[PDB]
From a paper:
[name], also known as 3C-like protease (3CLpro) or the [name], is a cysteine protease responsible for cleaving 11 distinct sites of the polyproteins to transform into mature functional proteins. 3CLpro is a cysteine protease with a Cys145-His41 catalytic dyad in its active site, which recognizes P1 Gln and P2 Leu/Met/Phe/Val as its substrates. 3CLpro plays a critical role in viral replication, and its inhibition prevents the formation of replication-essential enzymes, such as RNA-dependent RNA polymerase, thus inhibiting viral replication. Thus, 3CLpro is an attractive target for small-molecule oral therapeutics for treating [name]-19.
Author numbering:
A (entry chain A): 1 to 70, 73 to 221, 223 to 301
B (entry chain B): 1 to 301
Write the structure that this text describes.
């Protein structure tokens, strides 16, 4: 019993984390086979951070301007792919796990290994929000910390951290260096956009609560279109049939149909929680996917 | 910035996790140097698990009755012994991946990371607090017995919890690494249940400081208080007493924020007396007590 926000075990990723130094700029890098992946912001200096020309900044450096440590790696090739740098090194990481690069979709979750100076400090779970931010915990030096999921022995890397926006949320890229959302790697004013709640995830969590003995919030039914109207009023993402489909195995296990759980959610939205808690939380929680629930509950 | 329940990176502990099997009973063990540590419950068969005679079950065993598997590697057991509620299995191989480590027995209020494991295979990591009633609010299914809790300091792992059982309210009870249970619980079926719990007061104040450092300020009021007057309020709200030692522990956060500990106490006082009025603090609608002052410093420095 019990339900908690749980990260994947970080050992496979820990052995991949390096420090990347270019002149007087340092951050975190990801060493896999004979290649170190890191954010291209590593080539800027204090002066450059406001509107850097990365192409032009990069030309002013060769293979030997980049210091990789985790020991020492000798850099023998460099290239910029989108917003990340690929540094070919002479040594294949003997600690390289089976891995894949994947671009996740909004509302999916992953584990973050928060790192500083190439050294792992902590691990936590979070969601790619609908507005393509994450609500992490990062301080200066955490650039290049990565997010991932694990499938038995394979690590799917989906996120590399770049920056904190003025609002205190975080943005970054896939491991091919394309930002999630409309963000750019420069210190300018950047609007995140409306942060909507991941409806399918909130429903999953309500299933998790029923599996764990929290049932006071059950009852009425509703309709998709009727529920979706309430969704928009409360800045919840619209609920589609594919979402109803993804929730099938939890519905099946609990004997609670999706639309009955929606009608339960309507009352919570329209009426609040009347001072009660669900899985020890006094608000609706949207960072567990249906898969997350199933995994933890079996 | 931002604030999250954050576990320690688990790799150092992952490499110590093994599977221990005795007949058809299996669970997790911890392999450090040439010793494997696990719950003694593993020597029970189904028919013994209700009211076991551990001394009796143990004497009937030899080394070869214990199968220890570290991933694919079959270890060979060359000694066995029982210490309180754990078993200690001497094996012929020292664990090449043994971190620098210590065993520590923690106080109520302190937090640790749990690596939840099944069949000696790690499945997830999350943070927990030892509750004042000596349970933890974890996430554990059957087969998690022997999973460990720990803290890490530089390269040194401090092991503080080995998981044994789930109580009927769905909370969790276990031992330190010398095998002595936290709280009054026993490794057998009895009428045992979790006491009434209280809130870890010094942790709430640390988390309020954390909120301040992240830009939450609405709860900061014009009042101050005394330690005496504050403790009267705490008692009413089933909060643990705040001691002058606690005040001293909170010194650093006070120095970083420039809010005197007694001024923060008066803020908490108002929060307890009037509730939060539907506002949030660090994305929470309740007062959180599972961050230590250490946890806060770690994450806001
Ligand atoms: C709260 N902070 C964060 O979430 C992450 N973050 C960070 O870690 N570092 C930043 N700038 C910086 C400063 C110094 C430095 O090296 C020096 F110590 F030698 C190296 C770097 C990368 N930034 C700001 C940032 C702004 C951007 F526009 C970016 F594109 C970017 F990658 C980072 C962080 O946000
Ligand atoms: C929700 N469950 C838990 O948190 C932990 N838990 C557990 O993982 N296993 C249990 N019993 C069991 C069953 C079969 C078995 O071998 C077989 F699987 F091959 C091995 C074991 C240990 N128990 C019950 C328990 C009761 C006690 F009195 C204990 F002392 C104890 F250590 C475990 C769990 O609670």
């Amino acid at each position: 019993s019990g339900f908690r926000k749980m990260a994947f075990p970080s050992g496979k990723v820990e052995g991949c984390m390096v420090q990347v130094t270019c002149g007087t700029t340092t951050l975190n890098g990801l060493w896999l086979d004979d290649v170190v992946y890191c954010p291209r912001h590593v080539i800027c200096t204090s002066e450059d951070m406001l509107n850097p020309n990365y192409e032009d900044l990069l030309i002013r450096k060769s293979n030997h301007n980049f210091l990789v440590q985790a020991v020492q790696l000798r850099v023998i090739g460099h290239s910029m792919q989108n917003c990340v740098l690929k540094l070919k090194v002479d040594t294949a990481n003997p600690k390289t796990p089976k891995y894949k690069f994947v671009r996740i979709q909004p509302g999916q979750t992953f584990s973050v290994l928060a790192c500083y100076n190439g050294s792992p400090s902590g691990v936590y779970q979070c969601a790619m929000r609908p507005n393509f931010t994450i609500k992490g915990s990062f301080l200066n030096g955490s650039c290049g910390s990565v997010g991932f999921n694990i499938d038995y022995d394979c690590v799917s890397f989906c996120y590399m951290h770049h920056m904190e926006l003025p609002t205190g949320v975080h943005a970054g890229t896939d491991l091919e260096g394309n930002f999630y959302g409309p963000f750019v790697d420069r210190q300018t004013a950047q609007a995140a956009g409306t942060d909507t709640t991941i409806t399918v995830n909130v429903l999953a969590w309500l299933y998790a609560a029923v599996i764990n003995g929290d049932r006071w919030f059950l009852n009425f039914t509703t309709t998709l279109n009727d529920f979706n109207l309430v969704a928009m009023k409360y800045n919840y993402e619209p609920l589609t049939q594919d979402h109803v489909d993804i929730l099938g195995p939890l519905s099946a296990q609990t004997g609670i149909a999706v639309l009955d759980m929606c009608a339960s959610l309507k009352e919570l939205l329209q009426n609040g929680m009347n001072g009660r808690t669900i899985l020890g939380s006094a608000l609706l929680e949207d960072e567990f996917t249906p898969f997350d629930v199933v995994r933890q509950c079996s």
